[PDB]
Amino acid sequence: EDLGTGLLEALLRGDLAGAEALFRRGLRFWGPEGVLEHLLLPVLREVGEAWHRGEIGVAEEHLASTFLRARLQELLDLAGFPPGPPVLVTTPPGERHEIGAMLAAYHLRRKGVPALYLGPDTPLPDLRALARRLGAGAVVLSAVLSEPLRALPDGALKDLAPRVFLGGQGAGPEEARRLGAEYMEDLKGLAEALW
Amino acid sequence: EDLGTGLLEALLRGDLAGAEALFRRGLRFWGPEGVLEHLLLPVLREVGEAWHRGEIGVAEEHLASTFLRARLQELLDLAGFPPGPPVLVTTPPGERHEIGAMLAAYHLRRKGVPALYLGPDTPLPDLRALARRLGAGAVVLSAVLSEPLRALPDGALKDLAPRVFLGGQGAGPEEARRLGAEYMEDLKGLAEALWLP
Amino acid sequence: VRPEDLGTGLLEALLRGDLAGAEALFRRGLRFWGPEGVLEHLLLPVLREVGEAWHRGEIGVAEEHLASTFLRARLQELLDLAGFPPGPPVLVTTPPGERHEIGAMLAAYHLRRKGVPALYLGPDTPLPDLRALARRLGAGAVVLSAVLSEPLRALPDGALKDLAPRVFLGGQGAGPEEARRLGAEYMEDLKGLAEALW
Amino acid sequence: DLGTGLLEALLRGDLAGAEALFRRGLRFWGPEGVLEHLLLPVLREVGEAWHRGEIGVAEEHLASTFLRARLQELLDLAGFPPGPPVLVTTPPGERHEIGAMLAAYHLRRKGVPALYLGPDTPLPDLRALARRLGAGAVVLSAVLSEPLRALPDGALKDLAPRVFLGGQGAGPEEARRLGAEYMEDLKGLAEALWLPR
Ligand code: B12
Ligand code: B12
Ligand code: B12
Ligand code: B12
Ligand SMILES: C[C@H]1O[C@@H](n2cnc3c(N)ncnc32)[C@H](O)[C@@H]1O
Ligand SMILES: C[C@H]1O[C@@H](n2cnc3c(N)ncnc32)[C@H](O)[C@@H]1O
Ligand SMILES: C[C@H]1O[C@@H](n2cnc3c(N)ncnc32)[C@H](O)[C@@H]1O
Ligand SMILES: C[C@H]1O[C@@H](n2cnc3c(N)ncnc32)[C@H](O)[C@@H]1O
C-alpha cells in the first residue's frame, strides 16, 4: 500500500479523515521517527515539487502543509519534556518554514532534552535575551532557504547561547562558520552533540 | 483572569508542563468554548499588548502563541471534520496571524460544517480555484490587520466561492462591502449564517 | 458526547466488541484531557468500573480481559511515543506473583514523560533476577507496583532492600508500613516519582 | 544478523536501538517476514538461553514485553475486517500470549475479524462472551500441554460453532478429547474457514 500517494491524494481532495487515518497507519508501521522520514517528509517534498512544476496552486499546498504540521505538533506534545535548562529551537529571521525546527525539537525531546519550540522567524536580539534569561544550554536553528542566512552579518549567531547549532537545506558548513554556529547535518546527531 | 495570568507566567518560565496543566484545568473547568473565551484569547491579547509596551520580547510571544495554536489545533481535531461540501477558511494575502482563522474553523466545525482550515495567507486566484474544484459552498477569511484588506482592489473577494464571509478585528462593514464579502460581526453570526439544517 | 460520558461510552463500545469506536473514544479523551489526564480521567476509572462490574456479576472475565487488553495497548502506544533518554535505566516491574501490570506501565510512563529512562520489564519478576539485571545495567532505581497486598505479604522482611540504589514501592496493594518492612521507599503519587529519583 | 543484534540491544537495555532494529526488519521483510525472521527466532532463543542459565528471568521479561508490544501494534494496524468476530485467547492457566496474538494477526491479515482477548480465560466466561458477541469461531493457543490436560472432556465444544486449537502444547488427540478442531499451523487456520466442516 502506497501511503505517500494515498495521503497526498486524500489531502488534495480535502479528505482530512482519510488523511488522518492514513498517517496513523504510517505511524504504526514505521514508528514515530520513521513516519516522519518515510511519509511526512516525502509528502511535503512532493507538494513542493507539484507547486514548483505549476501543477497545484498555493491553496492546495497550504491545505496539505497545515495538516502535516498539526500531525507533527501532535507527536511533539506526546514526547517527554524533562525539567532542567531548555534548548530553544526556532528559525532565522525571515525563515517562515517551520517544520525543520519542529523536527529538531522532536528528535531532541525523544532523547530526553527539554527542547522548547518557539515557532519560526525569531529576531536574534530577542532570542538571545530569552536564551540567557532561561539559562538555555543551546539554541538550534533550522534554515530551509539560504537567503535568510545570507542577510545576516558575519558572526550574527555566535552569542545566542553556549552552543549554537544550525542545520537544514539552506545551511552549510561555510555559512555556519561565517555566522559563528556549529553546522549539524543529521537530526539524530543533535542530542548526541549535546549528550 | 487569575488562571490566565498563571498560564502566561508558566509560559514565560519555559514551564511547558506547568502551562499544559493549567490549560487542561481550564478545559476541565470551562469546557472548550469556555476555555477559548476565558483563557486562550485573553492570553494572546495580553501577550500582544505586553510586547507593544516593551514588557516582553518577540521570542516570548512566539513561545506563547505557538503553544496556544497547538492547543487550538487539538480542539479543532476534537471538534471533528464532517464530510460533505467544504467551507475553506484562511486569511487574506499578507495576513500572517492565523489564530482567528482557526477559531472560525473551530466554531463552524462545532456546528457540523466541514470547515477546511488552510492555514494563513492564501492568494485569491489560488483560493478561488481550490474552492471551485472542491465544490466548496463558502470561503471564510479572518483579517486581524486592516492593511491586507486595504491593499485589495474593489470587489476582490466577491467571487471566491458561492458565499464569501469576512470578519476579524481588521475587517469592518464598509471594507467588506467595498471588497464584495459578507461581513460577519462575530463568530456566532458566522456559524449561524452557514449552519445547514 | 460529553467528556463526562466518555467512560461509559468507552465501556459500552468495548462491551459490543467495537474496538475501532473504542479507539476513537480513547483518542478523544487524550485530546481533551492530555496524556497524563486521559490515564487519570478515562483509563483508570474504566478499569475500576470493569472490576466492580465483574465483582457484581454484571460482566464476566472475558469482558474484563477484552477491556484491559485494549487499555494496555492504548497505554503502550503512549509509552512508545514518549522520550527515552540514554543514561542509567530505572527498571519497572511488579513483585513476584503480581500479574496486574498496568500500574507498573503507568509508573514507567510518568518517568519517561519526565525524561527518565524507565525500562518496563512486564509483571512478576523474581527478585534475584531483578537484582542481577539492575546491578548489571547499573540501574539507578527499581520501581515496583503492587495492586494486590498478598504478593507483598508473601515476601520476607527486607526482601526489597538491596535490589538497586533506590527501590520504590507503590500501588493500591502497598502501604508505608509494608514498604518499611520490605526495605523499600513508599511512594503514593506517580507525579512524585520522577521528582524523588533526582 | 538482525535477530542477533535485536537480542543484544535488548540485553543492554538499549530500547531505542532495539526499536530501530525491529523497524529495519519491518521495512526489509514486511510485516509477515519480520515475524518469521526476527520476532519468533528471538523469542525462541530467549527461552533457550534462559533454560541454559545464560540469561535470567528479568532479561527474558524485557525482551518478551518489547516483542509483545511490537506485535500488538501490528495487530492494531491490521484493523477491522467486516463481520462477526472470531475470539482468540489461551486456555485457563496458559499465560503465554504471543501465539494467540499471532493467530489473531494472521486471521486479520486474511480479512477475518479476530478479536484478541488477552490470555488465560475461564471457559464459562469465554462461552458467555462468544454468545454475547455472536462470534462465529473461537481460537485457542496452547503453548504448554498441562492447561489442556486439566480441562474436562468436551470442554471446548460449542464455545462457538467452530472452535480451533493449536500451538506447541496442543495435538490432534487432545483436540479431539476437548471437542475442538486441531490446526497444525497458522496457514491451515485461515484456510479452514474458507469452507465449512
Ligand atoms: C510548506 C512550505 C512553505 C510554507 C511553509 C509553512 C510553515 N508554516 O512551515 C509557506 C507557504 C510559508 C512557504 C513559503 C515559501 N516557500 Co516554501 N515550501 C514548503 C514546502 C512544500 C514544505 C516545507 C517543509 O516543511 N519542508 C520539509 C523540510 C523541512 O525538510 P527538509 O528541508 O528535507 O529538511 C531535512 C533536513 O534539512 C533536516 N533539518 C531541517 N532543519 C534542521 C535543523 C537542524 C539543526 C538539523 C540538524 C537538521 C535539520 O530535516 C529534514 C530531514 O530530512 C517546501 C518543499 C520542500 N522540499 O521542503 C517548500 C519550499 C521550501 N518553499 C520554497 C519557496 C521558494 C518558498 C517561497 C519563496 C515561495 C514564494 N513566496 O514565492 C516562500 C518563502 C517564505 C519564507 N520567507 O520563508 C522552495 C525553496 C527552494 C529553495 N530556494 O531552496 C521549496 C523547496 C519549494 C520548491 N520546490 O520550490 N513554503
Ligand atoms: C500571535 C501574534 C502574531 C504572530 C502570529 C503567529 C501565527 N502563526 O498566528 C506573528 C509573530 C506572526 C505576528 C506578527 C505581526 N503582528 Co502580531 N500579534 C499576534 C497577537 C499577539 C495574537 C494574534 C491572534 O491570535 N489574534 C486572534 C485573537 C486573539 O484576536 P481577537 O482580536 O480576540 O479576535 C477576535 C475576533 O476578531 C474574532 N475573529 C477573528 N477572526 C475572525 C474571522 C471571522 C470571519 C469572524 C466572524 C470573527 C473573527 O475572534 C476573536 C474572539 O472573538 C496579536 C494581539 C491581538 N490583539 O490580536 C498581535 C498583533 C495582531 N500583531 C500586531 C503587529 C504590529 C504585528 C506585526 C506587524 C509585527 C511586526 N512588526 O513584524 C507582524 C505582522 C505579520 C502579518 N503580516 O500579519 C499588532 C497589530 C496592531 C495593528 N493592527 O496595527 C497586534 C494587535 C499587537 C499589538 N498590540 O500591537 N503577530
Ligand atoms: C485488569 C484486572 C486484572 C487482570 C490484569 C491484566 C494485566 N494487567 O495484564 C487479570 C485478569 C490478570 C487480573 C487477575 C486477578 N485480579 Co484483578 N483486576 C483487574 C482490574 C479490573 C484493573 C486492574 C488495573 O489495571 N487497575 C489500575 C490500577 C493499577 O490502578 P490503581 O491500583 O488505582 O493504582 C493507582 C495508584 O496506586 C498508582 N500506582 C499504581 N502502581 C504504582 C506504583 C508506584 C511506585 C506509584 C508511585 C504509584 C502507583 O496509579 C494509579 C492511580 O494513579 C482491577 C480493578 C481495580 N480496581 O484495580 C482488578 C482487581 C485488582 N483484581 C482483583 C482480583 C481479586 C484478581 C484475582 C485474584 C482474580 C482471580 N480470582 O483470579 C487475580 C489475581 C492475579 C494475580 N495478580 O496474581 C481485585 C482485587 C481486590 C483485592 N485486593 O482483594 C480487583 C480490585 C477487582 C475487584 N475485586 O473489584 N485482574
Ligand atoms: C516469553 C515466555 C514466557 C512468558 C510469557 C509472557 C507473555 N506472553 O505474556 C512468561 C514469563 C509468562 C513465561 C512463563 C512460563 N513459561 Co515460558 N517461555 C516464553 C517463551 C520464551 C516465548 C513464548 C512465546 O511467545 N513464543 C511464541 C512462539 C515463539 O512460539 P512457537 O513455538 O514458535 O509457536 C508457533 C506455533 O505453535 C504456532 N501457534 C501458536 N499458537 C497457535 C495457535 C493456533 C490455533 C495455531 C494454528 C498455531 C499456533 O505459531 C507459532 C509460530 O509458528 C517460550 C519459549 C518458546 N516458546 O520457545 C517459553 C516457554 C514456552 N516457557 C516455558 C516455561 C517452562 C514457562 C514457565 C512454567 C516458567 C516458570 N517456571 O514459571 C511459566 C509458565 C506460565 C504459564 N502458566 O503459562 C517453557 C515450556 C516448557 C514446557 N514445559 O513445555 C518454554 C518453552 C521455555 C523453555 N525453552 O523452557 N514464559
Ligand atoms: C513553498 C510554497 O510557498 C507557497 N507560496 C508561493 N507563493 C505564495 C504566496 N504568494 N503566498 C503564500 N504562499 C505562497 C507555495 O504554495 C509553495 O508550495
Ligand atoms: C504581534 C507580534 O509580532 C511579533 N513581532 C514583532 N516584530 C517581529 C519581528 N521582526 N519578527 C517576528 N515577529 C515579530 C511580536 O512578538 C508581537 O507580539
Ligand atoms: C480482577 C479480574 O480478574 C479476572 N479473573 C477472575 N477470575 C479469573 C480467573 N479464574 N482467570 C482469569 N481471570 C480471572 C476478572 O475478570 C476480574 O475482573
Ligand atoms: C519461560 C520463561 O518463564 C520465565 N520464568 C521462569 N521462572 C519464572 C518465575 N518464577 N516467575 C516469572 N517468570 C519466570 C523465564 O524468563 C523463562 O524464559
From TrEMBL, chain C:
GO terms for molecular function: cobalamin binding; DNA binding; DNA-binding transcription factor activity; identical protein binding; metal ion binding. Cob(II)alamin 13 binds at residues 98, 100, 145, 172. The keyword Lipid biosynthesis does not apply. The keyword Hydrolase does not apply. Cob(II)alamin 9 binds at residues 52, 68, 145, 149, 172. Cob(II)alamin 8 binds at residues 52, 55, 100, 145, 149, 172. Cob(II)alamin 1 binds at residues 40, 48, 51, 55, 97, 99-101, 145, 172. Cob(II)alamin 5 binds at residues 48, 97, 99-101, 145, 172. Keywords: DNA-binding, Plasmid, Transcription, Transcription regulation. Cob(II)alamin 12 binds at residues 97, 99-102, 145, 172. Cob(II)alamin 10 binds at residues 64, 100, 172. Cob(II)alamin 11 binds at residues 55, 100-101, 145, 172. Residues 87-198 form the B12-binding domain. This is Probable transcriptional regulator.
Automatic annotation (TrEMBL), chain D:
Cob(II)alamin 6 binds at residues 44, 94, 96-97, 141, 168. Cob(II)alamin 9 binds at residues 48, 64, 141, 145, 168. Cob(II)alamin 13 binds at residues 94, 96, 141, 168. Cob(II)alamin 5 binds at residues 44, 93, 95-97, 141, 168. Cob(II)alamin 1 binds at residues 36, 44, 47, 51, 93, 95-97, 141, 168. Cob(II)alamin 3 binds at residues 44, 48, 51, 64, 96, 141, 145, 167-168. Keywords: DNA-binding, Plasmid, Transcription, Transcription regulation. Cob(II)alamin 2 binds at residues 93, 95-97, 141, 168. Cob(II)alamin 10 binds at residues 60, 96, 168. Cob(II)alamin 12 binds at residues 93, 95-98, 141, 168. Cob(II)alamin 8 binds at residues 48, 51, 96, 141, 145, 168. Cob(II)alamin 4 binds at residues 44, 51, 96-97, 141. Cob(II)alamin 11 binds at residues 51, 96-97, 141, 168. GO terms for molecular function: cobalamin binding; DNA binding; DNA-binding transcription factor activity; identical protein binding; metal ion binding. Residues 83-197 form the B12-binding domain. Cob(II)alamin 7 binds at residues 44, 96, 141, 168. This is Probable transcriptional regulator. The chain holds residues 82 to 278 of 285 of the full protein.
